[PDB]
Amino acid sequence: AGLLDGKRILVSGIITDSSIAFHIARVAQEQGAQLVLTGFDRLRLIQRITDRLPAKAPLLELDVQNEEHLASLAGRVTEAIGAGNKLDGVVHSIGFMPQTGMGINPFFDAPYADVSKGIHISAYSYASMAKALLPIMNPGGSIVGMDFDPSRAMPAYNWMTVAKSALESVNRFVAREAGKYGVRSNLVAAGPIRTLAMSAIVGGALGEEAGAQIQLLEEGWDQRAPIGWNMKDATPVAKTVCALLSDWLPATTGDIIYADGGAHTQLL
Amino acid sequence: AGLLDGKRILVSGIITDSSIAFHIARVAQEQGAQLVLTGFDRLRLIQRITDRLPAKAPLLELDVQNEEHLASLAGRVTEAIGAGNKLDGVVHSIGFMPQTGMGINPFFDAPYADVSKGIHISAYSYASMAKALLPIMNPGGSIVGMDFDPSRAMPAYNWMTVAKSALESVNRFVAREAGKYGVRSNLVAAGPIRTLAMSAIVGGALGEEAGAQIQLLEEGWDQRAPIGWNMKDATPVAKTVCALLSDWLPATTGDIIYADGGAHTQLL
Amino acid sequence: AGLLDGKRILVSGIITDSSIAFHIARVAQEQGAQLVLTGFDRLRLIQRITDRLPAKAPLLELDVQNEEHLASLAGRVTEAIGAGNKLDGVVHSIGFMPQTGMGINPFFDAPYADVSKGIHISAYSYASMAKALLPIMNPGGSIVGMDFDPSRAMPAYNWMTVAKSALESVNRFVAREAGKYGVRSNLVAAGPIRTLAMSAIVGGALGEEAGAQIQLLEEGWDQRAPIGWNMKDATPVAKTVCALLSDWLPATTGDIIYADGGAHTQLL
Amino acid sequence: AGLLDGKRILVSGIITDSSIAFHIARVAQEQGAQLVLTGFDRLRLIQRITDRLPAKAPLLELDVQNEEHLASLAGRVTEAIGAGNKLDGVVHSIGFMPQTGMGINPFFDAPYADVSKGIHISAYSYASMAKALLPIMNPGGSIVGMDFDPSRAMPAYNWMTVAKSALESVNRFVAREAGKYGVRSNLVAAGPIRTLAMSAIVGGALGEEAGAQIQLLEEGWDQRAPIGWNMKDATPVAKTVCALLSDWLPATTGDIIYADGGAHTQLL
Ligand SMILES: NC(=O)c1ccc[n+]([C@@H]2O[C@H](COP(=O)([O-])OP(=O)(O)OC[C@H]3O[C@@H](n4cnc5c(N)ncnc54)[C@H](O)[C@@H]3O)[C@@H](O)[C@H]2O)c1
Ligand SMILES: NC(=O)c1ccc[n+]([C@@H]2O[C@H](COP(=O)([O-])OP(=O)(O)OC[C@H]3O[C@@H](n4cnc5c(N)ncnc54)[C@H](O)[C@@H]3O)[C@@H](O)[C@H]2O)c1
Ligand SMILES: NC(=O)c1ccc[n+]([C@@H]2O[C@H](COP(=O)([O-])OP(=O)(O)OC[C@H]3O[C@@H](n4cnc5c(N)ncnc54)[C@H](O)[C@@H]3O)[C@@H](O)[C@H]2O)c1
Ligand SMILES: NC(=O)c1ccc[n+]([C@@H]2O[C@H](COP(=O)([O-])OP(=O)(O)OC[C@H]3O[C@@H](n4cnc5c(N)ncnc54)[C@H](O)[C@@H]3O)[C@@H](O)[C@H]2O)c1
Ligand SMILES: Cc1cc(N)n(Cc2nnc(Nc3ccn(Cc4c(F)cccc4Cl)n3)s2)n1
Ligand SMILES: Cc1cc(N)n(Cc2nnc(Nc3ccn(Cc4c(F)cccc4Cl)n3)s2)n1
Ligand SMILES: Cc1cc(N)n(Cc2nnc(Nc3ccn(Cc4c(F)cccc4Cl)n3)s2)n1
Ligand SMILES: Cc1cc(N)n(Cc2nnc(Nc3ccn(Cc4c(F)cccc4Cl)n3)s2)n1
Structure with missing residues (x-):
């Protein structure tokens, strides 16, 4: 049968059909999962997409x-x-x-109110979600979050990289709490994915340089990756989230699984 | 319709039914895989176990x-x-x-001939095996090896830790080679498993102190592991190897997946 | 003759004579540095201590x-x-x-307003300070910050660990900015030190069950440390900050120097 | 006075006036150290250089x-x-x-006898040297070794990267032993240095493709390094070894100090 046959899974973060969560939900459903989806703000739009x-x-x-x-x-x-x-x-x-915190604005010019909003949504909310849903989770359960390797600094990502560094730390503590429930907590550190926002930057929404920057990042990622990297395909990332949601990684918690073509393991 | 249905997999390293490879072979077979097994010396003695x-x-x-x-x-x-x-x-x-390189013997007292034999078998042979089998591997294929986290020094493991550090490096280069074939190369970093050598030291083979060291390591591993660690159960490790052998981790290469109860992510 | 002879150094963070910054200030002055000190809130107490x-x-x-x-x-x-x-x-x-975010209070019960205050002071302000002072820094200059290894989760430190993970990321970006000035940016990852909040007999935000855990950490740190760890001596930490302030680590930036007795490199 | 005033230091590895050890020996001597030098094979030539x-x-x-x-x-x-x-x-x-183990020869084609020779000299000998010299070392003493970051695979370096991964593990165990003497053990991970052998590769000794590979590595290193990287200057590397030989990094053991311009902390 399917890899998630008879599993009840909550999937947050669908906004467009390009969203990593849309692919996670599609692959999970293909694999037998019964989903509950959570959306933010534009709920008639999310419903049209879902x-x-x-x-x-x-x-x-x-x-x-x-x-x-x-x-x-x-x-x-x-x-x-x-x-x-x-x-x-x-x-x-x-x-x-x-x-102000991610893009073309200087690193030093991001006001803390903006950085704090981003850290709240991107890092702290992983703990918020776990606090709320762990009481209604089954033993053997799995919490998965989305990461972008922040172990080395890079242009443009700035405070989003800082927020992912915090997310990685939050995951390790969430794992401690989740373990009390027989639940695992892990991250999928994905390579760059061409969501609508990424396609817009590459297209020059924030100028030629920010575009060139993303194209350069993507080029080097595919180059370093021993099995390559297709930023236009979220299916390898979606499949990895499902592997963690399954019973096939039962001794992995407070960890990071890299779905990046193996780019982080190569220098050049 | 198991995880590895219709897959032809070579499994090396079965010596006893306690061997991690025996459990890998059992879970793979349960999951629909057609196996080829390799044994070291015995063969006649190994066959009775397989x-x-x-x-x-x-x-x-x-x-x-x-x-x-x-x-x-x-x-x-x-x-x-x-x-x-x-x-x-x-x-x-x-x-x-x-x-001489692993146990009660001082770290400085291990002769290089012995360390070299250990590094050959434990690290270099991962490349040797890949060299031999990659020409008869299919695109989408997977090479999996066994690691014991060597990122921090520990008592007793001494030169086996050094050998695993070398293994980790070998796997990153094997990934480079494997990628040319559409093949992934990864390591499963397992927590301590009660295999032949482990049961011997615990049993008193290298004296009371050595046995006590292993029991203390195992106690602390289960303590750190937010989901616990049963050194008498290789099934969580075997399931992880199968996850890597499957098509569910398709964007992971030159990497390490930790099947250790999440112990390496916790300080205390 | 001194290591920091003729150097003008700004030292922030003195509150008591137990403060890591007090020892940094003392060692730097002993080594020929001319200091400017910054204090917060209790400027009368600070003046008397300085x-x-x-x-x-x-x-x-x-x-x-x-x-x-x-x-x-x-x-x-x-x-x-x-x-x-x-x-x-x-x-x-x-x-x-x-x-609420550091101690015996559950990890999930720390309100974001509190976590955000802590991240502002502990992580964001490293960038705030660099933004303000880099325009009045000389080429060859050095920015040093204080870190507590957050790569693995631990009891009691909770959101302070999350804040240090963010600090580490901030440092890598501050290095990018500082480099434009010929200035280095690094963190000193110290072992635990009995400073104001860590105090067990006189003062301190650490009491009851939390105090018990910090005693287990102390003993564990010194056992792991191949050269030992004295939680009552900030001089080894102060000397390391001075090494980074000097011209003797000229090719190190966006990095972390561990003054921890080597505990982080040992498992047991 | 000098940073290593009144210190008796043994310096191994001088073969040419371009050797990293020649610069270490020069800076140490400039800083007041009294040295003992060890040379291999061409001792009449080493004498001429020294x-x-x-x-x-x-x-x-x-x-x-x-x-x-x-x-x-x-x-x-x-x-x-x-x-x-x-x-x-x-x-x-x-x-x-x-x-056969480093260069233009395929990774899989390196015979183990060659790899074993390289691992003996590059990794195991760090332990051999410590075994021999620790009994004649003073408390507060320092053992320093040379490293080239092996955490990610790279072209050409192959089994030298594997040997450095082993060296890093050896260092962590040497620290355990050294600690019993009040001696620290650390590695300096340097960026690429134009030694005679490196100048020969860049110049085409192993063909145009190998030269271009080294030139490309060096270009990327200077690019990522927020403070740049001059492969033609070993002084920043030599100064870092001296910082570790001094009393200014007294709480650092079993560790790695990166003298690489900060490159390893930057993705691009
Ligand atoms: N695109 C990439 O290259 C990439 C790479 C690695 C990781 N990621 C991560 O993957 C995740 C998904 O991002 P994506 O690339 O699919 O883009 P996305 O815009 O489709 O998804 C981000 C989601 O966050 C939601 N969100 C924002 N604020 C919220 C709030 N206050 N409450 C609830 N939901 C809120 C948005 O509605 C959206 O659905 C993010 O954590 C992102 O950082 C993206
Ligand atoms: N047991 C643990 O705690 C633990 C933890 C992490 C990793 N590992 C690793 O898992 C792997 C399997 O070991 P195990 O724990 O199942 O024990 P094991 O003793 O059952 O297996 C090791 C195998 O290596 C084989 N072998 C030895 N020398 C050989 C040679 N020259 N040629 C071919 N085969 C040879 C033996 O025949 C044996 O089957 C090893 O790489 C081990 O280091 C073990
Ligand atoms: N003590 C340890 O075990 C340990 C270990 C590793 C790192 N550190 C770090 O070392 C640094 C120094 O702390 P310490 O341990 O010496 O204790 P401490 O309490 O003496 O110092 C912390 C300082 O932060 C100042 N401060 C707080 N809020 C501020 C604000 N809004 N603006 C300006 N200053 C503010 C305080 O006035 C105080 O001087 C901290 O960053 C701490 O996280 C401490
Ligand atoms: N040059 C670089 O790009 C670079 C970068 C990082 C680290 N390193 C490391 O720095 C160290 C110094 O090398 P280098 O680049 O200065 O080149 P080098 O060739 O000048 O020095 C290496 C030394 O090893 C000695 N040696 C070899 N076999 C020996 C043996 N059996 N016994 C004793 N000595 C022996 C040689 O005589 C020589 O002095 C090495 O560990 C090297 O791996 C070099
Ligand atoms: C890790 C990761 C990657 C992506 N796309 N996400 C989701 C986002 N969350 N907040 C974002 N906000 C911002 C501010 C500016 N941009 C555009 C931009 C850029 F300037 C530089 C790089 C990439 C992008 Cl998309 N996006 S993007 N998370
Ligand atoms: C990582 C790992 C675990 C196991 N079982 N293996 C396979 C081995 N291969 N060679 C081995 N040889 C030896 C020599 C002595 N011992 C026993 C011992 C010890 F002294 C100290 C610590 C642990 C152990 Cl098991 N094992 S163990 N690899
Ligand atoms: C890494 C580090 C160490 C120290 N002293 N600092 C500076 C601080 N700044 N604010 C702090 N606030 C708080 C709240 C509670 N405590 C006490 C406590 C605890 F309950 C559990 C563990 C350790 C401590 Cl100290 N301290 S500690 N940073
Ligand atoms: C980490 C490091 C760097 C350097 N130079 N060393 C010292 C050496 N020890 N043995 C070496 N042996 C060999 C075999 C072939 N080459 C030439 C070559 C290459 F093919 C690829 C890259 C760089 C070079 Cl120089 N060097 S180089 N250690």
Whole structure:
């Protein structure tokens, strides 16, 4: 049967059909999973997109910055999957950093209010989500988050790299808490993916240099990667999240699995 | 419709039914894989152990230190799986370090001839095996090897830790070579497993202190592991090797997946 | 004759004579450096403590959360060292995490407002300080910050570990900026030291079950440390900051130097 | 006075006036150290080179592969520095990998006899040297070895990268032993240095493709390094070894100090 056959999985972070979460949800559904989806702000738009998934799935509003949304989350999920049922998987595919903190603006010019908003959404919310959903998770369960290797500095990513460094630390502590429930907590450090936003930067939305920068990053990534890297294909990343959601990585927690073509293991 | 259905996989390193390779072979077979097994010396003695696996599998002699064994290996594998057939997976579960380099003997007292024998078997042979089998491997294939996290020094493991540090480097270069074939190369860094040598030291073979050191390591490993660690259970390790042998980790190469209960991510 | 002879160095973070910055200031002064000191809140207590240093040094108010304090900082430093003079070194020995995010309070119960305050002071302010002081720094100069190894999760440190993970990332980006000035940026990852909040008999934000855990950390640190760890001696840490402030580590930037007795390199 | 004033230091690995050890020996002597030098094979030539150092220093024969040379080493050093005197420092600047294991030959084609020779000289000998000299070292002493970051694979370096991975592991264990003597053990991970052999490759000794590979590595290194990288200047590397030989890094052992311009901390 499917790799996630009979598993109830919550998938957050679908905004467009280019979203890494859209591919995670598609592959999970193809693999037998029953999903609950969470969306933020543009809920009629998210619903129009989630309608294109292989199967029907409840859509729940979740702004990770809203305390009431988090407090009611477990209650709202239980109502959607049915009383007496628990989640076997949670996918955090949420990330945000204002333009002041990521892009063409100098590193020193990012106001802390902006950096703090980005760290809240990109790092702290991994713990928020785990706090809310662990009480309605089954033993053997899995929490997966999305990472972009922050171990070395790079142009443009700036405070998003700082936020991913914090996310990596948050994951290690979430694992400590999750373990009390028999639940694993891990990250998928993916190589660059051509989402709508990335296609817009490459296209010059923020100028020729920011575009050239992303194309240069992508070129070197495919070059270093012993098996190559196709930024236009999120399926290898989606498959890796599903591997972690499955029972096939049962002794891995507080960790990072690199779905990057093996680029991080090569210098040149 | 198991995880490795229709896959032809070579599994090296079975000596007892406690061997990590025995559990890898058992889980792979349970998951629909057609296996070729390689054994070191015994063969007749090894065959009686492989006979206890869920299904029949050809047993081939392979001493990684013997040049003729490696030269003839691909030819012998092809004969066993049938002309026109190729391997989809290779499992290197081979390791050895003489008592002089691993145990109660001081680190400075290990003669280089002994360290060299251990490095040959435990590290260099990962490249030797890849060299021999990559020409008879299919695109999308996977080479998996066994590691014991050498990133920090520890008592007793001494030169076996040094050998694993070399193994980790070898795997990153093997990935470069394997990529030319569409093949991934990765290591499963396992927590301590009660195999032949481990059960011997615990049992008192190198005295009361040495046995006590291993029991203390194991206690602390389970303590650190947010999901715990059972050194008497190789199934979580075997399942992880199968995840890497599958098509569910398609963008991971030259890497290390930690099947250690998440112990390496926790300080205390 | 001294290691920092003729060097003008700014030292932040003195509150008591137990403060790592007090020892950095003392060793730097012993080594020929001319200092400018920055203090926060209790500027009367700070002045009396700084009066105990081997030599006189101007004391300037600096709350890293106050925008005006940062905007006026370079101007105020220049006034103290004399027009036409620039800093050769900058020491960031600033850290803070509320009791909700560091201690016995559950990890999930730390409100983001508290975590954000801690990340602002402990991580973001390293960039804030570099932004303010780099325009008044000389080529060959050095920015040093204080880190506590966050690569593995641990009890009690909780969100302070998350903040140090962010600090490490901030340092790599600050190095990029500093390099444009011929200035190096590095962190000193110290072993635990009994400073104001760490205090067990007189003062301290550490009490009851948390105090028990920090005692287990202490003993563990010294056991792991091949050269031992004295939590009551900040001199080895102070000497390491001075090594980075000197011209003896001229090719090291965006890095971490561990003054921890070597504990981080040992498993057991 | 000098950074190594009154310190008795053994310096190995001088073969040409371009050798990293020649610069280490020159800077150490400039900084007040009294040295003992060890040379291999071409001792009349080594003497001619070492005659160009700022001060006279005894030259001792030491082939790290010769057991008698190691057994007699401490005795021979004591005779040179005078009875009752001990070394305060030891510099291991020894490295070798045959052309089959480093260069233009395929990674899989390196015979183990060649790899074993290279690992013996480049990694194992760090432990051999420490075994021999620790009994004649003073508390507070320092053992320093030379490294080239092997954490990521790269073209051409092949089995030398594998040997450096082993060296890094050896260092962590040597630290455990050294600590019993109050002696620190660390490695200096240097960026590429234009030694005679490097100038020969760049110049086309192993063909145009190999030259271009080295030139490309060096170009990328200077690019990533926030403070740049001059492969033609060994002084920043020599100064870093001296910082470790001094009393200014007293809490650092079993570690790696990167004298690489900060390159290893930057992706691009
Ligand atoms: N695209 C890449 O190259 C890449 C690489 C590695 C990791 N990632 C990470 O993958 C994740 C998904 O990003 P993506 O590339 O699919 O882009 P995306 O824009 O499709 O996804 C990010 C999601 O975060 C959601 N979000 C933002 N603020 C929120 C809030 N307050 N509450 C709830 N949801 C909120 C958005 O609605 C969106 O659905 C992010 O964590 C991102 O950092 C992306
Ligand atoms: N047991 C643990 O705690 C642990 C932890 C991490 C990694 N590992 C690694 O897992 C692997 C398997 O070891 P194990 O623990 O299952 O024990 P094991 O004793 O059952 O297996 C090691 C195997 O190596 C084989 N071997 C030795 N020399 C050989 C040679 N010259 N040619 C061919 N084969 C040779 C032996 O025949 C044996 O089957 C090793 O690489 C080991 O280092 C073990
Ligand atoms: N003590 C340890 O075990 C240890 C270990 C590793 C790193 N460190 C780090 O060393 C540094 C120095 O801390 P310490 O241990 O000497 O203790 P400390 O309490 O004496 O020093 C922390 C300093 O931060 C200052 N500070 C707090 N909020 C501030 C603000 N808003 N603006 C400006 N200054 C502010 C305080 O006034 C104080 O001087 C910190 O960054 C700490 O995280 C400490
Ligand atoms: N040049 C670089 O790009 C670079 C970068 C990082 C590290 N390193 C390392 O720095 C060290 C110094 O090498 P270098 O580049 O200055 O070149 P080098 O050739 O001048 O020095 C290497 C030394 O090893 C000695 N040696 C070889 N076999 C020996 C044996 N059996 N016994 C004793 N000595 C022996 C040689 O005589 C020579 O003095 C080596 O460890 C090298 O790996 C070099
Ligand atoms: C790790 C990662 C990668 C991506 N795309 N995400 C999701 C995002 N979350 N917040 C973002 N905000 C911003 C501010 C500016 N940009 C555009 C831009 C850039 F300037 C430089 C590089 C890439 C991009 Cl897309 N995106 S992007 N997370
Ligand atoms: C990482 C790992 C674990 C196991 N079982 N292997 C396979 C081996 N290959 N050669 C070995 N040789 C020897 C010599 C002595 N011992 C026993 C011992 C010890 F003294 C100290 C620590 C642990 C052990 Cl098991 N094992 S163990 N590799
Ligand atoms: C890495 C480090 C060490 C120290 N002293 N600092 C500076 C600080 N800044 N704010 C702090 N605030 C707090 C809240 C509670 N405590 C006490 C406590 C604990 F409960 C558990 C562990 C350690 C400690 Cl110290 N300190 S500590 N940074
Ligand atoms: C880490 C490091 C760098 C250097 N030069 N050393 C010292 C050496 N020890 N043995 C060496 N042997 C060999 C075999 C072939 N080459 C030439 C060559 C190459 F093919 C590829 C790259 C660089 C060079 Cl120089 N050097 S070089 N250690």
